[PDB]
């Protein structure tokens, strides 16, 4: 038994930007009141974890990154009521405290307890559960899933089906739910509509799944890597375009293709210029454009407000608009009943020890999701 | 008798930017097929008319401006079926052709036959019905209401109640409908919400009327001219703030006052900086901001897309989102049935000959709407 004791285990520590992860021993403290210690089973490699390495997404270093994962509860702190030792669980990078104005709002999901807007890299109490080489190490979004064991606040974990396959449902912790919800919840795509999806990685493929589920007649995938097109078509794209093949800006191309602009567009990359292009390719009077990609830290975009004055709607969202703790168990149940597929997103499987190879695969263009197993 | 003949009458011509209007004789051609010639009875002075004078809003010069008006049909061209000589009518600066993809959409109103996006200053057939001192003169938004007589395309006129008071219902042609619709149709303000309204002229006052009719609990008016506050409170504002009274940026003040951000905000001025402030002051996870003011020609705003990623919605609209020809007669009928008031908007009534005095009243801060009577 390890309950009440420090655990020594392996983790992937990031000591410096623009360097490989270091796989080495860390010390993981036992959970305090209203905290949960989790044995990790599987974790996905998402572009947002890479953004921590590149300095795109700023959070304090040194850090244990990872936010898309699933595992098994090892122990619970005083007062925990919503999970027990042995339960299967998904960590929630967006918490659901249930008590703030956002949690109480029908449409709100970006709980005020989040660590994303002004990242601190701690537990809710302002302290760390991790030591490495005798030094404190920061958490990431209250999750820190690149470790054999992590500690999370109770508002940042959801219990899931005991029969769930953790090497697949790890993707419900971020990329699948984000893209799917961006289409069906945030945009509210309509039957018979025309959609344009910018970026065909794991998150953009999940947006396509949601647009198909909503009954779109046309789903136009957009990527500068034409090797992404075959899988985009398998999951529902009706056509794909590469901006580098055209002499005109792709907003003009897409306006022509859609006979005056698309109904719904999605930016699923993280670039200023494609956020403005995606806006402008939606129909000027009634179009909707959703920003999903994470922008470069502290950088502003330039746009003409006449794009909005004619009637366009521009919005963004975290985690597909889903209230996290309510939604994750229901999404897992839907997956168990075959309402959506996760296999199309999983291109590579590696042991956790080969994390750096998994990041190489993402950076080269060759992977969608690599799943790491502990 | 004038039917079929050229009419010589008085108009206010703008020969070049940054000059007073010239009140002098013009010649008005008879209506061609599918056109309507109107005897003007009353026209309002809107800030958009002033933006033509200042070069804020680019349209071809020389021009007959004016777009917020009411009059009586003098004659009709071949093929007109929707109005007849003697009818009371309002000019529609946004047409409703009924045949384009925007008119057929349930939520679109910015008809593709409009002359706002790329102004040419003519009738639909690409020609002008006006001459002055032997020179052709441009039309403005297919209306040109600063003239004793104008000619409009059939898609740019609506028939209204024969008993309506034209000196009041002229405001349904632009400023009332726009502000009121921006609240009740575009934002869809909810019962119990907190709203912030930037700019307390005729259009912003009409936004306040709409927020109050929608049941908002709190309506915060924002203006640098404190003389605007008393009337804003009479029509529904619960509090007013002047940015110049505060050491901190007003987005921070309004976030504090609303215990974390407002539900709905409206930019009703036309400035890049207040568009970004208005978006920022709405709650980051579920807030909605609507741009109503007309921006400076060709200028781009700068903003951080993280304002949208957290969950805000940003939109704009023309004419309050109302389909123009369907809506204008219904709004007149609703005024006749006492469903809303127009008198709070009207501070001055002058003969048409005093047009320049009316614009100097607007520019000095001393008026809301001046109504000019022919
Ligand atoms: N809003 C949220 O809650 C949330 C959650 C998930 C991920 N993210 C963000 O979503 C984005 C996508 O994540 P992912 O894991 O799918 O990433 P990814 O890198 O696998 O996919 C991005 C795709 O964009 C393409 N691309 C790059 N530059 C392009 C350009 N100029 N034009 C067109 N295509 C271009 C790439 O070739 C790639 O296929 C990232 O920015 C990530 O940080 C946001
Ligand atoms: N979208 C549409 O269809 C539509 C229709 C109506 C008019 N317009 C636009 O709406 C806007 C308002 O028109 P109006 O006739 O009510 O104008 P107005 O000038 O009477 O009112 C604008 C108000 O803004 C205030 N103001 C100016 N600068 C400010 C600042 N920096 N901060 C705070 N307050 C400030 C003024 O003191 C004034 O009371 C104009 O830009 C006009 O062109 C748009």
From Swiss-Prot, chains A, B:
Source species, domain of life: Eukaryota
Annotated Gene Ontology cellular component terms: cytosol
Binding-site residues for Zn(2+) 1, renumbered to this chain: 46, 48, 67, 174
KW Magnesium (keyword) present: no
Catalytic activity: a primary alcohol + NAD(+) = an aldehyde + NADH + H(+); a secondary alcohol + NAD(+) = a ketone + NADH + H(+)
InterPro entries assigned to the protein according to its UniProt record, in alphabetical order: ADH-like_C (IPR013149), ADH-like_N (IPR013154), ADH_Zn_CS (IPR002328), GroES-like_sf (IPR011032), NAD(P)-bd_dom_sf (IPR036291), PKS_ER (IPR020843)
Subcellular location: Cytoplasm
Sequence positions that bind NAD(+): 48, 199-204, 223, 228, 292-294, 319, 369
Record key words, sorted: Acetylation, Cytoplasm, Metal-binding, NAD, Oxidoreductase, Zinc
EC number: 1.1.1.1
Residues where Zn(2+) 2 binds: 97, 100, 103, 111
Cofactor note (record): Binds 2 Zn(2+) ions per subunit.
Keyword Cytoplasm belongs to the record: yes
Subunit text: Dimer of identical or non-identical chains of two types (E and S) coded by 2 separate genes at different loci.
Assigned protein family: Belongs to the zinc-containing alcohol dehydrogenase family. Class-I subfamily.
Identification of the protein by name: Alcohol dehydrogenase E chain
High-level lineage: Eukaryota, Metazoa, Chordata, Craniata, Vertebrata
